[PDB]
Amino acid sequence: SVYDAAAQLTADVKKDLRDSWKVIGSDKKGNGVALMTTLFADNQETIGYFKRLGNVSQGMANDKLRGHSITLMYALQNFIDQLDNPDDLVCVVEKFAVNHITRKISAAEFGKMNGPIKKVLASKNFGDKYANAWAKLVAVVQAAL
Amino acid sequence: SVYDAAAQLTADVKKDLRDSWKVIGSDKKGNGVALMTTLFADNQETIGYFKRLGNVSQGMANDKLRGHSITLMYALQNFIDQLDNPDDLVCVVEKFAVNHITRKISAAEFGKMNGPIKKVLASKNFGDKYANAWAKLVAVVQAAL
Numbered sequence: 604s605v606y607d608a609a610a611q612l613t614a615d616v617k618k619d620l621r622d623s624w625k626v627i628g629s630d631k632k633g634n635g636v637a638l639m640t641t642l643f644a645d646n647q648e649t650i651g652y653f654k655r656l657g658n659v660s661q662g663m664a665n666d667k668l669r670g671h672s673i674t675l676m677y678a679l680q681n682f683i684d685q686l687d688n689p690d691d692l693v694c695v696v697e698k699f700a701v702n703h704i705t706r707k708i709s710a711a712e713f714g715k716m717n718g719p720i721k722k723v724l725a726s727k728n729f730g731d732k733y734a735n736a737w738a739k740l741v742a743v744v745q746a747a748l
Numbered sequence: 749s750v751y752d753a754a755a756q757l758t759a760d761v762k763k764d765l766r767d768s769w770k771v772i773g774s775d776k777k778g779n780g781v782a783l784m785t786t787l788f789a790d791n792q793e794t795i796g797y798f799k800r801l802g803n804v805s806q807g808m809a810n811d812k813l814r815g816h817s818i819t820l821m822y823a824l825q826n827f828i829d830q831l832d833n834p835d836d837l838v839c840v841v842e843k844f845a846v847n848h849i850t851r852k853i854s855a856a857e858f859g860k861m862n863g864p865i866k867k868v869l870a871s872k873n874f875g876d877k878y879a880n881a882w883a884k885l886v887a888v889v890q891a892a893l
């Protein structure tokens with residue numbers, strides 16, 4: 604199942620993922636926080652899953668939110684680093700899904716991250732072509748939920 | 749406290765952490781699995797916390813163990829990257845501790861990783877000086893458990 608989704612990661616898709624990550628991943632704190640705050644802005648209901656982070660309206664200044672945001676970026680770093688070996692990509696994605704499954708986060712709920720990603724890519728001038736590539740990566744994770 | 753522990757990361761300790769990580773972090777899959785297998789070999793009592801992984805003796809062939817081992821290395825990568833900013837290191841460490849606290853992993857339990865780290869370091873020609881630097885980093889996490 605996850606393997607089949609991974610099959611959509613064509614040579615061109617992996618190339619766009621790597622090229623865009625080279626920029627996005629260069630500022631994990633800044634972009635990580637941008638993703639989370641955008642998610643909360645566009646889909647307020649997702650805040651229900653982050654009660655532990657406290658006052659998320661504080662953004663970057665909120666230590667717990669900042670800690671979560673930076674950490675989230677290292678999961679993507681992990682995924683990006685395993686793109687050339689489907690076997691490693693798959694085992695890393697299934698390992699990542701475990702805690703999210705426990706939190707009862709469905710594939711549909713997880714898919715809400717596509718908008719924030721598209722918006723962050725755009726802020727760095729990466730168009731639809733790149734947003735589509737990332738949608739495919741998110742789809743691999745969705746296959747594991 | 750975690751804030752006092754973070755202050756123990758002096759200039760040379762940070763430098764030795766970076767220099768050794770440059771090598772160790774080069775092969776996350778290889779060294780990550782070596783780290784876990786050494787832990788299970790030297791402290792069989794810890795295997796109980798990893799029931800979900802299945803037959804841990806299979807090493808690299810165990811997909812779940814490989815997935816976990818690779819992922820563990822990105823938490824260390826995270827810590828190393830935050831060495832420049834104590835405030836970020838602390839929020840990233842507390843974030844990391846949440847799940848380990850939920851699993852009831854105590855500071856004493858966590859410290860058992862010092863043995864495996866020292867051995868992997870040694871296998872790459874990094875002696876006591878480096879093992880001690882890493883123990884200082886591990887102590888920051890212990891302070892948060």
Ligand code: HEM
Binds near residue numbers: 649653655678679
């Ligand atoms: C590209 C998307 C995402 C990435 C890379 C990501 C990454 C992570 C990582 C690495 C962690 C820490 C390890 C763990 O506990 O699992 C985590 C925690 C968490 N994630 Fe995800 N996640 C993503 C999307 C989501 C979404 C869409 C939701 C909810 C709507 C979600 C909810 C959670 C929650 C509630 C936590 C715990 C937060 C805390 O209390 O510190 N994640 N995620």
Ligand code: HEM
Binds near residue numbers: 797844847858
């Ligand atoms: C260098 C030290 C260590 C690092 C960097 C580390 C890293 C991680 C990471 C990144 C995860 C995934 C996120 C999460 O679920 O929290 C994790 C999971 C876990 N860790 Fe730690 N950990 C370390 C030591 C330990 C020790 C010493 C124990 C137990 C004695 C432990 C027990 C666990 C368990 C049971 C899981 C879940 C495994 C699974 O079911 O997939 N960790 N750890």
